[PDB]
Amino acid sequence: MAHSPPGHHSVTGRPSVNGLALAEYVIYRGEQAYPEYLITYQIMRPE
Amino acid sequence: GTILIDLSPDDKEFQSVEEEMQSTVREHRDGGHAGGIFNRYNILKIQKVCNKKLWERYTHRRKEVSEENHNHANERMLFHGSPFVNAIIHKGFDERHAYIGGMFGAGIYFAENSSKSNQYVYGIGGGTGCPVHKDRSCYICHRQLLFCRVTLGKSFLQFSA
Ligand SMILES: O=c1cc(-c2cccc(O)c2)oc2cc(O)ccc12
Ligand SMILES: [Zn+2]
Numbered sequence: 001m002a003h004s005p006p007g008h009h010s011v012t013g014r015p016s017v018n019g020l021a022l023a024e025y026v027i028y029r030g031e032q033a034y035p036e037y038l039i040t041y042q043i044m045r046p047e
Numbered sequence: 048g049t050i051l052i053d054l055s056p057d058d059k060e061f062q063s064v065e066e067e068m069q070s071t072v073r074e075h076r077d078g079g080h081a082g083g084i085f086n087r088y089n090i091l092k093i094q095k096v097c098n099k100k101l102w103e104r105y106t107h108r109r110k111e112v113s114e115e116n117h118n119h120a121n122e123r124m125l126f127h128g129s130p131f132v133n134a135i136i137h138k139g140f141d142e143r144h145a146y147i148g149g150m151f152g153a154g155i156y157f158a159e160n161s162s163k164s165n166q167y168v169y170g171i172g173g174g175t176g177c178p179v180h181k182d183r184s185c186y187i188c189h190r191q192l193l194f195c196r197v198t199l200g201k202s203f204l205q206f207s208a
Contacts, residue, residue, distance in 0.1 A: 001154060009112050011152065031107070032105075033127070035096050036096055036193075037194040038096055039192045039194060042091065042186060045186045
């Protein structure tokens, strides 16, 4: 498991081409996330 | 010591979480290859994950990052989808849950788009799809995502193509 950019705690990937894609984030310590909700779901076939 | 508490769909907490899930769906450049063809979900259940050990571990680290960054933990709620969600809720995030091949390094990935995390529920690039039908667009089998509280701190800004 890799390391944070020196002096930072995480990385943000901001898509620059698809202007509708929201951000993605990477952390490098498991202690920096807490899994609060468990969502069970199906995808729905479009009409 | 994880216990899971079902939220009732009348609960304002349930609706809020469902809204953050349904409103952050988008179209994907792969035409649905990895995650399926869809515009919305049928939410079957939402459960609050309570684990004390894990929570104290989260907030102790939160306080550290906070103090290293002008008392700003930079806390978000973000999506995470993988085949290992049952381990995560019992034992916590760790190196097993990292994406070695990832664009921004070998760490734990998270999405603002629920539909992006959905692409990883059955593995990298959808793997071989649902276990019962081998179908990446299966409309029958139950899928599972996490909505997680994440400490970002000072975050390195990396624009991506
Ligand atoms: O939720 C995700 C899970 C994972 C993932 C990938 C590999 C292994 C794994 O256990 C999770 O990758 C992502 C990548 C992204 O750019 C955005 C979200 C995810
Ligand atoms: Zn299936």
